[PDB]
Design a protein around this nucleic acid. Structure first.
Lengths: 97, 93, 79, 75, 23, 274, 230, 98, 97, 80, 108, 96
DNA sequence: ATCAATATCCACCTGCAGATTCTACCAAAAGTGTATTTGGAAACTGCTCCATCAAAAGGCATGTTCAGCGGAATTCCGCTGAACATGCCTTTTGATGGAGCAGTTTCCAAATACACTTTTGGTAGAATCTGCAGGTGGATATTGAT
DNA sequence: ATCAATATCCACCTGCAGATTCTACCAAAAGTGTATTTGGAAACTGCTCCATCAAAAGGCATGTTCAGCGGAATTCCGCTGAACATGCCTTTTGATGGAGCAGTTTCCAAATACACTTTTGGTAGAATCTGCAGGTGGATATTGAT
């Protein structure tokens, strides 16, 4: 029934996890999303493991760069909570309409 | 001492509305627009030219390229027209 | 089907505390999975067109990674 | 020669007499605070005109070339 | 016997201060 | 040597062999004064200059004096004749400059001291009146009157604090003086440990161009002098080092005479005619 | 192999693994410093005035031999200055003096030349005296040497004694081909050993002249401070 | 007769084939692919042009000028990412105000 | 005298230079500044004065690039003016190297 | 051979930001936007001069700067 | 030492005919000057040989005598030489530059 | 089952730089793809520059300017240098 | 701030991929010795371009200003995350299971280079109309203070 | 709600370059046939490698409180958008003006294609061993209770 100041073990998680490069995801529901959204365009399609893993981490890099980006956008407006349209305009400004 | 392309664009323009006229910032600038969209299709040809894994080239690479580079509806009706025109070239024996 | 919640606040707990943000708007989910899926079904769809016109409905990574090398973030390392 | 090269000689010293304005006038008004109480004492007089003389000599050694620049740039 | 050019000259500087280098 | 130099207090056997007898090829004993420091060979014109004494402070403009010395900045274009002639003192001695044209615009900073006998001409380092390639300091010389105190190293403490309000860079030039190295790095030596004892934050090596006005091709050149560039730990780490624990105690426990950035008045000039 | 760059960091603490004999009578006397800096604008050449002095070699005929029976008292301070003058009182008018010391030009035809000559515009202070009325005292600065409160004008050295100044000024040019006792340099070469008038500058006769009228009374508040002792 | 009219549409063929000859490393290819390869400009070069001329109904700028040209093909948004890469002799920009 | 309000006459000047598209800079200080920062790393490199036309529209291109996205950064930040870390975020957002 | 800098050129901002729809500025970012313009363009003009000296030319062309602008990657109209 | 050279002329380190039919398989032009087609040994060498000297210290720092991948794009965008081109390198689990905001730590 | 193995040359040169030093294999394929990608892109650029120069042989020198330009300047200088020392020993069709 | 509970650093050590490195074949080329082709180099060389040269208009530009409104700094309501103990769900690492993708064959559709022959799409060109930017003039939005 | 000086919209009117559609002239890629191609069209075979279950444990939702942190406005201020009499290299405006083009011309180095050719890197893939990603405790770094 004893705990320290609220927020501390997240810092540990930063250390280990940005330090880590081990993955996160079950392969199956991710590729189940890709199959549900691709079988519509033609049924009976398969895929290979390096795609799911790299696509996962590449869009992770995408988003997690976006997360720090709108972190300093929020503290650029001197706050912490980002918005949606913050990351939208950053990523719009990265190249996607 | 050069070729032109905009004359073909003029006869296409009379196939469209023949009505409009020409400024020459706009004629030179449509000339540059068409020139770099020309090299643009050359570029995506280069990338298919790499990874076809082929050594003598097909025509389904042409159809698939004009399928693969471009958005939905304009490119779809594009590839329909292109097959249509080359098949009527083929009917023109 | 609607398995969008495979990625969620445990997922983005890890991969968003990795961002150094603390408090997400805890409805970022739909749009981050949207842009994720925009990238993915876009890049896999033209990968699939290449390889199933190469007559193969599995896809390697090289074609799809050249298609995202159009946006330039190319994975290498598996040939 | 021309009217253009006459300014090239007549700026720098012309910007240095203000330094002489900002350097000289102060010690004329400094060595004289104690003396009105007297109203050193009988042999210090030889300097008081000398530093006045450099407040006098400092101006015509230029005009021997300077004022005749008007005459050659007007004829 | 000697204070003649000494008292009749010293209104020039306040006639000089607003004359040239005040504008 | 030839026609040896009796200058002020301590003589010298002149260094480059005979540019004192350029046409001066018959005398023996040479008497130099200090103010304009005229290179008088012959005897009984020189004590005649002791009749001719009109100067108790030399022609050197003043942007500085401390408690002890005063600093000279030398527009050689107003006084024309002599303000070339002081390097002929170097051309007998420190031969590392040119007399190829009677060159008009070239600049100095010379140096003196307030002695109760009079102002004491005590040497100079070279300078350029331009903006070409670093144009502050080329040739270090501590004159054969007197060398061996700290001002023997304090020639080069002058270009850099000029560069503060000047807000651009000054950089030493190619004809180096060999003994000047034990000023050159030695001056820049403790400069690196200055913002080291504080500022554990991120440094850019042109923020010390906002601190010390140093250029990129040379601020790295003085960096590897203390081979100070350990890496493979997370950055290029300066490695706070146990040997150097001395002279950031010894700069503050064996403090040395340096200058102040506030007592000086100068403003940037305009280059006009050619 | 490469070199470092900006922006980086430094780790500080953690776990890493006979004296010449003659200057004492040559310089004593004290300089006055102010509490501030100095502005100095007088040339060092006219601090010397003339760069000419003459050594023992000819003045052993005159300083201890002619002063014995001279009617006007003959010093050395009056003589070394006057024979330093006229080299520049004639320098405008023989730049082809160069090739021969046989071509020295004699005083009998220097009579209209050097008597009313003007040494680098010499005489500028005497017509500057009449508006300045330094008529009792004598025209002295410290830029000036003190050898002019004692010395005497240029006339009654010539028109009492002038026939014996040029004389041994003559024979000692041919041994060096007319050069001075100090030949100036290797100055035959710099070599080795052995529309603007019409707009704004017309205040150049207004903004340095706005104190020339003041300059007649920059003296007067010290020119009034003199007649009191005696 | 012409490779316009044998191909039956407006454009001819083999020079762009020579451009893909000067693009080439497989070093030869079929003549019959090229006309649909030649189509790619055509079925592009429509996709921008008279899309202006809906604005021609009420203004009568009957010569096309460049900053008139970029008025609402810029609003024909489906390709428009690809022409942020399009640069141009003084093109011009438009409001989107908040 | 009569004086217009701060902002709505800025709104018509918004509309005025939106109504503009035309040439921005003069020829001369631009061409010489780029000419001298080329002059150093090779002595005098010629520019086609026509390609100085290309350079003037080139520097038009860089100004429209940076100022369109500084517009968009300002409307992100809830701020009326623009500043540094706007452009920092935009540049690393933009990929300077 | 004017080896002098004039690069602190201009608060042209007054319509640099009226081309866009953004309000008042007050700047001081002038110096570094100058620098970032100049640094990007010097990086692309050393490209163009290396092209032109491959062609062993004295100048870079409009065509050459077109090669510059396509190769940093924004394609240029008006100039072929 | 021998008259039979394997292009021993270069002290050579890289396969040569392979780069020549590389040159034959992208081959947009028809000619690449052949004695100057031996320059492509400098085309390969460099930054790969720079990272192997770059990657020394940490490997012994984490007490490891052979090589593992994941510390590398971290130092790539930290390596100020290569970071301009080092945008398109993304690795199978080779990482990022991890960095914590100092402003994240409120020291509380 | 039909490939080429590229880690060996860097493996040999890695031990000759750092005396007993092994490898991980993923980065081998990473950088082999990396080097031939940036090589083929500067090749396509160099060929097009050799097209719009209208002269028909690709040189060492223009692509060398490319690897002076987009290759970074210190190791660009290293590139010119090591290529030149390669070629200055690429002159031995001789005895010594 | 002085303990005591967690958490990093670190020591020493426990069953691995598995690197790797090696023989061993073994295809399998890349270096060896000629052929035939040019494109490179470059060189010559009028010229049209670019960098100056000078000067009355000259629209901005310069310092300078005047009194407005987000920015900064700063406020309490109100709380969406955030701290982790209890409840629950899909998992990972282990077993089979099949139609499609690598790699390989016979026939073919198309293509290189060539050989003929030519239109036509290309260039400098200047007539006519004209389109358009631009200048003129009445009627209609648009705001700052009262 | 209202007064009243600035700014803009639409038919009308004038210079100003010029577009365009072809005459004069060309020229050279193009249209179709013929031989000899050759990779691929397209089908066959091999044998898969992306797909199917089974046992436990290991992370997520949901919590209850809280709470550290703002969400939206207070006062100030400052600094400045809209003004401004009055400078600025700049801009036309041709002219100088001269010098690396580019377009032709012209040898040769040689790259590249030809067939041979001594060895050396692709793979089959195991010995073996061996550090090597991590389990288990000592010293100590971080950090809350009051």
């Amino acid at each position: 029934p004893h705990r320290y100041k609220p927020g501390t073990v997240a810092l540990r998680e930063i250390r280990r996890f940005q330090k880590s490069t081990e993955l996160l995801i079950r392969k199956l529901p991710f590729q189940r999303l890709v199959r549900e959204i691709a079988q519509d365009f033609k049924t009976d399609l398969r895929f290979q493991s390096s795609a799911i893993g790299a696509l996962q981490e590449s869009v992770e890099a995408y988003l997690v760069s976006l997360f720090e980006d709108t972190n300093l956008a929020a503290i650029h407006a001197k706050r912490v909570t980002i918005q949606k349209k913050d990351i939208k305009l950053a990523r719009r400004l990265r190249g996607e309409r | 001492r050069k070729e032109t392309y905009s004359s073909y664009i003029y006869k296409v323009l009379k196939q469209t509305h023949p009505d409009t006229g020409i400024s020459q910032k706009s004629m030179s600038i449509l000339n540059s627009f068409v020139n770099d969209i020309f090299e643009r299709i050359a570029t995506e040809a280069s990338k298919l030219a790499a990874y076809n894994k082929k050594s003598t080239i097909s025509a389904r690479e042409i159809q698939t390229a004009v399928r693969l580079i471009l958005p939905g509806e304009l490119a779809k009706h594009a590839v329909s027209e292109g097959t249509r025109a080359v098949t009527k070239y083929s009917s023109s024996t | 089907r609607d398995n969008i919640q495979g990625i969620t606040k445990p997922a983005i707990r890890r991969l968003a505390r990795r961002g150094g943000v603390k408090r997400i708007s805890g409805l970022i989910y739909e749009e981050v999975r949207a842009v994720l899926k925009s990238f993915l079904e876009s890049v896999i769809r033209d990968s699939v067109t290449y390889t199933e016109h190469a007559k193969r409905k599995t896809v390697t990574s090289l074609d799809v990674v050249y298609a995202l090398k159009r946006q330039g973030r190319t994975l290498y390392g598996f040939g | 020669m021309d009217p253009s090269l006459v300014l090239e000689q007549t700026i720098q010293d012309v910007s240095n007499l203000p330094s002489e304005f900002r350097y000289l006038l102060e010690e004329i008004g400094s060595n004289d605070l104690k003396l009105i109480e007297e109203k050193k004492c009988q042999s210090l007089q030889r300097e008081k005109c000398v530093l006045a003389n450099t407040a006098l000599f400092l101006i015509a050694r230029h005009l021997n070339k300077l004022e005749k620049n008007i005459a050659l740039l007007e004829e | 016997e000697q204070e003649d050019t000494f008292d009749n000259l010293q209104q020039e500087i306040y006639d000089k201060e607003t004359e040239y280098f005040s504008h | 040597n030839l026609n040896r130099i009796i200058m002020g207090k301590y003589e010298i056997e002149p260094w480059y062999f005979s540019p004192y007898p350029i046409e001066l090829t018959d005398e023996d004993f040479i008497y130099i004064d200090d103010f304009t420091l005229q290179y008088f060979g012959s005897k009984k014109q020189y004590e005649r200059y002791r009749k001719k004494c009109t100067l108790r402070h030399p022609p050197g403009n003043e942007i500085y004096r401390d408690d002890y010395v005063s600093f000279f900045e030398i527009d050689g274009r107003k006084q024309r004749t002599w303000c070339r002639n002081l390097c002929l003192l170097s051309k007998l001695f420190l031969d590392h400059k040119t007399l190829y044209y009677d060159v008009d615009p070239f600049l100095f900073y010379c140096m003196t001291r307030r002695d109760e006998l009079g102002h004491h001409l005590v040497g100079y380092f070279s300078k350029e009146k331009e903006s070409a390639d670093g144009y502050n300091v080329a040739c270090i010389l501590t004159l054969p009157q007197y060398q061996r105190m700290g001002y023997g190293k304090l020639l080069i403490e002058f270009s850099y604090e000029l560069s503060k309000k000047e807000n651009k860079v000054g950089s030493p030039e190619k004809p180096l003086s060999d003994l000047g190295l034990l000023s050159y790095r030695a001056y820049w030596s403790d400069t690196l440990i200055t913002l080291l004892v504080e500022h554990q934050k991120e440094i850019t090596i042109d923020e010390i161009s906002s601190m010390t006005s140093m250029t990129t091709t040379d601020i790295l050149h003085t960096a590897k002098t203390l081979n100070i560039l350990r890496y493979y730990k997370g950055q290029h780490i300066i490695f706070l080092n146990e040997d150097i624990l001395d002279r950031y105690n010894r700069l503050k426990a064996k403090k040395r005479r340096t200058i102040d950035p506030n007592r000086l008045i100068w403003k940037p000039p305009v280059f006009t005619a050619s | 192999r490469k070199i470092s760059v900006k922006q980086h960091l430094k780790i500080y603490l953690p776990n890493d693994l006979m004296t010449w004999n003659e200057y004492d009578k040559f310089y004593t006397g004290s300089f006055q410093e102010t509490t501030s800096y100095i502005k100095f604008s007088a040339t060092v050449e006219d601090c010397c005035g003339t760069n000419y002095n003459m050594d023992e070699r000819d003045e052993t005929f005159l300083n201890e031999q002619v002063n014995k029976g001279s009617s006007d008292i003959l010093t050395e301070d009056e003589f070394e200055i006057l024979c330093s003058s006229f080299e520049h009182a004639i320098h405008e008018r023989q730049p082809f003096l160069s090739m021969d010391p046989e071509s020295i030009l004699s005083f009998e035809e220097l009579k209209p030349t050097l008597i009313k000559s003007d040494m680098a515009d010499f005489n500028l202070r005497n017509q500057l005296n009449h508006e300045i009325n330094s008529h009792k005292t004598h025209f002295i600065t410290q830029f000036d040497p003190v050898s002019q409160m004692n010395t005497r004008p240029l006339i009654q050295l010539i028109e009492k004694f002038g026939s014996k100044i040029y004389d041994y000024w003559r024979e000692r040019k041919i041994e060096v081909n007319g050069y001075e006792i100090f030949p100036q340099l290797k100055f035959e070469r710099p070599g080795e050993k052995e529309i603007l008038n019409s707009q704004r500058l017309r205040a150049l006769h207004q903004e340095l002249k706005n104190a020339k009228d003041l300059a007649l009374l920059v003296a007067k508040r010290e020119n009034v401070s003199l007649n009191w002792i005696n | 007769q012409s490779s316009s009219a044998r191909a039956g549409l407006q454009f001819p063929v083999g020079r762009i084939k020579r451009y893909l000859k000067r693009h080439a490393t497989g070093r030869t290819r079929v003549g019959s692919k090229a006309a649909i390869y030649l189509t790619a400009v055509l079925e592009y070069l429509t996709a921008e042009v008279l899309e202006l001329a809906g604005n021609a109904a009420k203004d009568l700028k009957v010569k096309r000028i460049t900053p008139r040209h970029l008025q609402l093909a810029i609003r024909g948004d489906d390709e428009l990412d690809s022409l942020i890469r399009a640069t141009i002799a003084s093109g011009g920009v438009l409001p989107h105000i908040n």
